[PDB]
Write a protein that binds this ligand. Structure first.
Ligand SMILES: *[C@@H]1O[C@H](CO)[C@@H](O)[C@H](O)[C@H]1NC(C)=O
Length: 386
């Protein structure tokens, strides 16, 4: 409704004041009760999901500011992309991510690139350039003490509602803006991925969800606040698994908005969960990786959450653009070589344009004191969006 004022998607909701659902919110029904039926409907539902996530847990994601400039220099195989961002009131900040390049002549359209939060913890293939993004500089993340601290807040103000992870997303968007105006960086901006591990994996998921120029999203062992769902993690903690959950996470750090504190004890009233956050990547590609050795990561919650999110790609007819691999037997953020084929399949297909098959959806079902029962959490029937 009200398309003449708001555009093609009309008056998307940012709140649902009467919501109360202990199971997972339905991806395929808008807040107003309209059912999704077409693939185009997904674009508008994703916009509504973005507004709901910002309202309840992420804070405000500012749009591109009126000043974004960039200069590039290179020494050896290392480029430095010096970025400046500024507001209409003259306030400016600067940050300078570095890029590690393969040697020699690039492909005609430039190197594919993975934006790696704090360098990431995945093996990046030799034909893909790596941009090291210091997300902690953009928004600090030591503990609850870090609230409102970081370069982002030196631009927008320390009381700005963006969570640290939303601030990190904004920084990624500026990096891509910079790359698109800097041909000498020799990056194929149509083949950019994002990755990070642990808290930086929560960050990478947020980046892929909210920044649509990311072609491939790779969250690694992101746990609670990442590819796990709040409702499922509450079920785990109530049944004796020592998981991270919504209540603890908001006291531990600043990855979520202060407003989320008002909902962590009332999760059924939140008209979203992280299955909808992950689904915001669709129709682009994502594979996330989880580790069952650490109950803190909430293993069942990630499997159930990603199974729920997967229904969006299934409804869009592109199930193989979304992968999930969950295994045990390795240290946190250590990369197990047994998963390298799955990682490379997604990188090869979505960043390197190879005909790799990307049907990856596997778990060992090692969930501790709980089991996954899809009927207790997913109530919707996946439509075939037209
Ligand atoms: C319900 O909301 C969606 C998203 O704003 C919109 O596209 C749709 O037109 C709305 N339904 C009606 C009947 O206005």
């Amino acid at each position: 409704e009200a398309e003449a004022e708001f555009g093609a998607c009309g008056a998307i909701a940012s709140t649902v004041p009467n919501y109360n659902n202990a199971k997972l919110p339905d991806p395929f029904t808008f807040a107003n009760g309209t059912a999704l039926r077409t693939k185009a409907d997904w674009s508008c539902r994703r916009a509504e999901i973005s507004a709901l996530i910002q309202n309840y847990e992420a804070g405000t994601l500012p749009p591109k500011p009126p000043v974004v400039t960039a200069s590039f220099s290179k020494s050896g195989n290392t480029g430095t992309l010096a970025i400046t961002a500024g507001l209409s009131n003259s306030q400016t900040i600067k940050f300078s991510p570095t890029i590690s390049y393969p040697s020699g002549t690039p492909p005609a359209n430039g190197w594919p690139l993975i934006i790696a939060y704090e360098g990431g913890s995945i093996p990046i293939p030799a034909g893909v350039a790596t941009l090291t993004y210091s997300n902690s500089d953009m928004a600090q993340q030591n503990s609850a003490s870090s609230r409102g601290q970081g370069l982002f807040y030196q631009l927008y103000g320390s009381t700005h509602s963006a969570s640290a992870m939303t601030a990190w997303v904004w920084g990624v968007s500026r990096i891509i803006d910079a790359l698109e105006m800097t041909p000498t960086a020799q990056i194929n901006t149509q083949r950019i991925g994002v990755t990070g591990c642990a808290r930086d994996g929560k960050g990478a998921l947020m980046a892929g969800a909210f920044e649509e120029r990311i072609a491939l999203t790779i969250p690694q062992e992101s746990g609670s606040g990442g590819d796990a769902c709040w409702r499922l993690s509450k079920y785990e903690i109530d049944n004796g698994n020592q998981v991270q959950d919504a209540v603890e996470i908001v006291g531990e750090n600043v990855w979520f908005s202060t407003n989320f504190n008002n909902y962590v004890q009332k999760l059924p009233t939140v008209p979203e969960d992280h299955h909808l956050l992950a689904a915001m990547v669709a129709p682009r590609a994502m594979i996330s990786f989880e580790n069952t050795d650490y109950l803190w990561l909430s293993p069942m919650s990630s499997f159930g959450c990603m199974t729920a999110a997967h229904t969006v790609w299934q409804g869009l007819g592109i199930a193989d653009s979304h992968g999930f691999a969950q295994v045990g037997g390795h240290a946190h953020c250590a990369w197990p070589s047994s998963l390298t084929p799955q990682l490379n399949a997604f990188i090869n297909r979505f960043l390197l344009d190879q005909s790799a098959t990307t049907n990856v959806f596997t778990t060992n079902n090692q969930f501790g004191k709980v089991q996954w029962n899809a009927a207790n959490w997913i109530t919707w029937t996946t439509p075939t969006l037209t």
